[PDB]
Amino acid sequence: NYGYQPLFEDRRPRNIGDTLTIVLQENVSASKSSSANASRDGKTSFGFDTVPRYLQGL
Amino acid sequence: PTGTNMQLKNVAAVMVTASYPPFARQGQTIDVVVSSMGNAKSLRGGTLLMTPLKGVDSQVYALAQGNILVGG
């Protein structure tokens, strides 16, 4: 005797020793990315090509 | 086989309701109500197959099987 068995219920595992089908379908995907930047450019100039007389000493 | 077309006409899926009486004992018989669930037309001369009647705790307290009486 295997005990009471439901008639219309779907066949499910209920006790120790019962079998069950596992459909292994795994799809995992993780990603991450980052960046940082900094820039600085500086140019400066001053030139006196021709200096008038009253400015010579300066 | 899983892949097969089954088009029946003499079978209806039904829900069965019953009342558990006070001090009920195994072997005693109770009346049940049988109600169609989807797109069925009539249950005039049908027969209810073995149906386990569950309680709120989802435990079998009775087994239902018999011939339906429909007014008509």
Swiss-Prot record, chain A:
Location(s) in or outside the cell: Cell outer membrane; Bacterial flagellum basal body
The record's similarity note reads: Belongs to the FlgH family.
Q: What does this protein do?
A: Assembles around the rod to form the L-ring and probably protects the motor/basal body from shearing forces during rotation.
- Tell me how this protein assembles: The basal body constitutes a major portion of the flagellar organelle and consists of four rings (L,P,S, and M) mounted on a central rod.
Q: What is this protein called?
A: Flagellar L-ring protein
Recorded source organism is: Salmonella typhimurium (strain LT2 / SGSC1412 / ATCC 700720)
Gene name as annotated = flgH
**Span within the entire protein?**
59 to 116 of 232
From Swiss-Prot, chain B:
Localization:
Periplasm; Bacterial flagellum basal body
Q: Which domain of life is it from?
A: Bacteria
Looking at the UniProt entry, the stretches that span the membrane are none
Chain's role: Assembles around the rod to form the L-ring and probably protects the motor/basal body from shearing forces during rotation.
Query: Subunit structure of this entry?
Result: The basal body constitutes a major portion of the flagellar organelle and consists of four rings (L,P,S, and M) mounted on a central rod.
Q: Which family does it belong to?
A: Belongs to the FlgI family.
Q: What is this protein called?
A: Flagellar P-ring protein
Species of provenance: Salmonella typhimurium (strain LT2 / SGSC1412 / ATCC 700720)
**Span of the entire protein shown here:** 74 to 145 of 365
